[PDB]
Amino acid sequence: SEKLTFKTDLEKLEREKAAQIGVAIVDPQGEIVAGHRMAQRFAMCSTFKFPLAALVFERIDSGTERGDRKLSYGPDMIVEWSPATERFLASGHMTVLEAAQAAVQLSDNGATNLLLREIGGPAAMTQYFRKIGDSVSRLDRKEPEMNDNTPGDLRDTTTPIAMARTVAKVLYGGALTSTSTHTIERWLIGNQTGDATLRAGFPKDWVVGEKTGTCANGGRNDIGFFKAQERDYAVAVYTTAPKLSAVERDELVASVGQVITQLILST
Numbered sequence: 001s002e003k004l005t006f007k008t009d010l011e012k013l014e015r016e017k018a019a020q021i022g023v024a025i026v027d028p029q030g031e032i033v034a035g036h037r038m039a040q041r042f043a044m045c046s047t048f049k050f051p052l053a054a055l056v057f058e059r060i061d062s063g064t065e066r067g068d069r070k071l072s073y074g075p076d077m078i079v080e081w082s083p084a085t086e087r088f089l090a091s092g093h094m095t096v097l098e099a100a101q102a103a104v105q106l107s108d109n110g111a112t113n114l115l116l117r118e119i120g121g122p123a124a125m126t127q128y129f130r131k132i133g134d135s136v137s138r139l140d141r142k143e144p145e146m147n148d149n150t151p152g153d154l155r156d157t158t159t160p161i162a163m164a165r166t167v168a169k170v171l172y173g174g175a176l177t178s179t180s181t182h183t184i185e186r187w188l189i190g191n192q193t194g195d196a197t198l199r200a201g202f203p204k205d206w207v208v209g210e211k212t213g214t215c216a217n218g219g220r221n222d223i224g225f226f227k228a229q230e231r232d233y234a235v236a237v238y239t240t241a242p243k244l245s246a247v248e249r250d251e252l253v254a255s256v257g258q259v260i261t262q263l264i265l266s267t
């Protein structure tokens with residue numbers, strides 16, 4: 001079966017790369033298409049920034065936040081990998097929309113913390129997950145501590161199936177207005193950090209958008225959506241490979257993308 005090939009090929013990567021690979025693919029209604037270690041806990045790291053943007057747009061939709069609100073900050077806001085936040089520092093602020101775009105498309109960590117402060121912190125992020133029917137995903141810390149990925153630590157974790165269903169809810173399940181949905185989808189497509197990961201394993205003609213993550217202890221993740229053969233899918237991929245190089249971890253995620261492609265095209 002196509003399903004057996006999918007399992008076998010993922011386990012081949014696990015064995016040869018000494019990795020753990022979590023995968024969930026669901027349809028727009030959140031029904032399972034395929035999975036691997038789908039109920040296993042993995043650190044979200046930067047993948048959570050996609051849900052964070054959804055939270056922000058939900059508040060914009062509800063009129064309790066404005067995209068043009070200026071969020072002021074100083075040097076203390078700058079953390080490792082804050083390319084946009086550093087550029088805007090002299091000006092003294094980034095708007096909500098600028099910060100959200102930087103968080104999603106550049107994985108800017110300063111901008112992420114700036115937004116977290118504005119919307120109510122990890123508590124607010126976790127409440128949002130709960131609100132959209134995700135009882136699993138949880139944010140406990142901010143950048144950079146949330147990326148520690150200490151084995152067995154439940155902080156700042158999700159499971160592939162929980163996250164994939166969250167992506168589906170946000171993009172296909174009416175969590176946001178069509179306008180806000182479209183804005184986030186286009187940001188995901190135009191993301192600048194995912195060229196070497198999941199989408200490098202998908203066919204050139206698929207419409208795909210995604211958000212990457214990188215965790216200590218060899219974490220490399222990618223979540224998002226793709227349209228293939230006129231059907232829409234939500235996908236979450238979490239990997240851990242402590243002994244691989246950074247480039248090899250990119251290649252691993254792209255390889256998982258190729259395995260996903262083979263399954264999807266066989267159906």
Ligand SMILES: *C(=O)/C=C/N[C@@H](C(=O)O)[C@](C)(Cn1ccnn1)[SH](=O)=O
Pocket residue numbers: 045046047080081107109143144145147212213214215216
């Ligand atoms: C989202 O995935 C953010 C990841 N942040 C990591 C990373 O990109 O690997 C940081 C930047 C790792 N780090 C520490 C010192 N220099 N890079 S950090 O925010 O954990």
Ligand SMILES: C[C@](Cn1ccnn1)([C@@H](N)C(=O)O)[SH](O)O
Pocket residue numbers: 046081106107108193194211212213214
């Ligand atoms: C990998 C980054 C952060 N980064 C980039 C360069 N050094 N750190 C991480 N936040 C991610 O998205 O996985 S990003 O550029 O993709």
